Amino acid sequence: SGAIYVGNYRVVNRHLATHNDWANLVWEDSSRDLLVSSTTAQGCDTIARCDCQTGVYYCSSRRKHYPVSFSKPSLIFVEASEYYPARYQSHLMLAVGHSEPGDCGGILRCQHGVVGIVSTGGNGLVGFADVRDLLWLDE
Ligand SMILES: COc1cccc(Cl)c1CC(=O)N1CCC[C@H](C(N)=O)C1
Ligand SMILES: [Zn+2]
């Protein structure tokens, strides 16, 4: 679990969104595993606007932060689950690092701010849904 609180927005994995998130929907994209809902309180986080390929992510299944090198946001094949059929997930960045299903929502950050959230994983890899292109989160 985990979310990005920026201004009047809450960014979550679409597959973990709540009834409240869907009742206050701003935008969602199943192909990115992202959903953005509105909030009344002002958000605590800052978003990065960069092409960084190094950062640190929070891994709840180890209660630890890990430094990672990660790929550029791209279309990557993702196996079927109770949430989605087998498909290509866009804007996904892969890194070598530990992750388990409950790790989704963990934040990835670089020196410029929040880069994205854990969305996929498997066999020593971890995938992050990028949010750096969502310029409207700031305005
Ligand atoms: C961090 O996720 C891990 C880690 C290790 C192993 C596994 Cl199966 C996962 C879970 C995972 O990749 N899923 C299930 C939830 C929907 C995801 C998606 N389509 O964006 C795909
Ligand atoms: Zn950066």
- With CA atoms as reference, report the closest residue to 11 among 100, 20, 2: 2
- CB of 92 shorter than 6 A to ligand 1: no
Q: State which residues form the domain around 22.
A: 3-44
Which residues have a Cβ under 8 Å from the Cβ of 135 and sit 6 or more positions away? 49
- Claim to verify: residue 28 and residue 54 sit in the same structural domain: no
Q: Are residues 100 and 77 in the same domain?
A: yes
CA 61/CA 133 separation, integer angstroms: 28
Which tokens belong to 126? Answer: 């971890």
Closest CA to 128 of 44, 138, 99, 139: 99
Judged by its nearest atom, the ligand closest to the C-alpha of residue 82 is: 1
Task: Return the ligand 1 atom nearest residue 99 CA.
Answer: 4
The verdict on 72 and 131 lying in the same domain is yes
From the number of C-beta atoms within 10 Å of its C-beta (0-12, 13-18, 19+), residue 11 rates as buried
Experimental method: X-ray
Resolution (A): 1.7
Taking residue 20's Cβ as centre, other Cβ atoms within 10 Å add up to 10
How many other CB atoms are found less than 10 A from the CB of residue 104? 23
Instruction: Identify whether residues 25 and 75 lie together within a single domain.
Output: no
Q: 19: Cβ–Cβ under 8 A, 6 or more apart, which residues? A: none
Q: How many CA atoms does the CB half-sphere of 18 hold within 13 Å?
A: 10
User: In this structure, what is the dihedral angle of CA atoms 37, 38, 43, 47, given to the nearest 10 degrees?
Assistant: 50
For 19, the enclosing helix (H) or strand (E) is helix 19-23
Cβ 47 vs Cβ 109: under 8 Å? no
Concatenating the DSSP letter of every residue in 52-90 gives --EEEEEEGGGTEEEEEEBPPSEEEEE---SS--SEEEE
Residue with tokens 């992202």: 34
Q: Which residues are annotated as a binding site for Zn(2+)?
A: 50, 52, 110, 112
Side chain identity, residue 25? L
Is the same domain home to 104 and 124? yes
